[PDB]
């Protein structure tokens, strides 16, 4: 009780991922987002990669939409959300597509596992541990 993020167990390694921005698709995701309030407190990641069911096996777990806010959270869902360029097209390295080609998304996927926290937005960090939670 009494704090500034009020929260009951804080996490430590936050896992954000990225999903084309803006200029840095890597910076501007986090970096950007982290660009908020002010850095410390905790280790905030940024990595720009497909958030696989796989790794999200986790998340999908500790969140409602689990991989559903993932595939939801770039464009053309109902391609990606089923079978779609979710195919070998975003899987390994959606970077790759994100970076520019299908579509330019900027959205930023925020996950703990932590705390087993997760959220896809970039406010889910700031709710949760923004730039210096």
Not at 14 to 27: E, G, Y
Not at 81 to 95: V, W
Not at 107 to 114: I, S
Request: charge should be positive; glycine fraction near 4%.
């Amino acid at each position: 009780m009494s704090f500034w993020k009020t929260l009951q167990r804080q996490p430590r390694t936050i896992s954000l991922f990225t999903n084309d921005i803006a200029s840095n698709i890597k910076s501007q995701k986090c970096l950007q987002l982290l660009k908020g309030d002010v850095s410390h407190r905790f280790d905030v990641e940024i990595a720009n990669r497909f958030p696989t069911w796989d790794q999200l096996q986790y998340m999908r777990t500790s969140c409602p939409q689990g991989p559903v806010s993932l595939q939801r959270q770039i464009p053309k869902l109902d391609s990606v959300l089923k079978y779609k360029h979710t195919d070998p097209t975003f899987g390994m390295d959606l970077q790759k597509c994100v970076q520019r080609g299908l579509w330019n998304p900027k959205e930023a996927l925020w996950v703990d596992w932590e705390n087993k926290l997760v959220g896809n937005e970039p406010a889910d960090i700031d709710k949760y541990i923004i730039q210096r939670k």
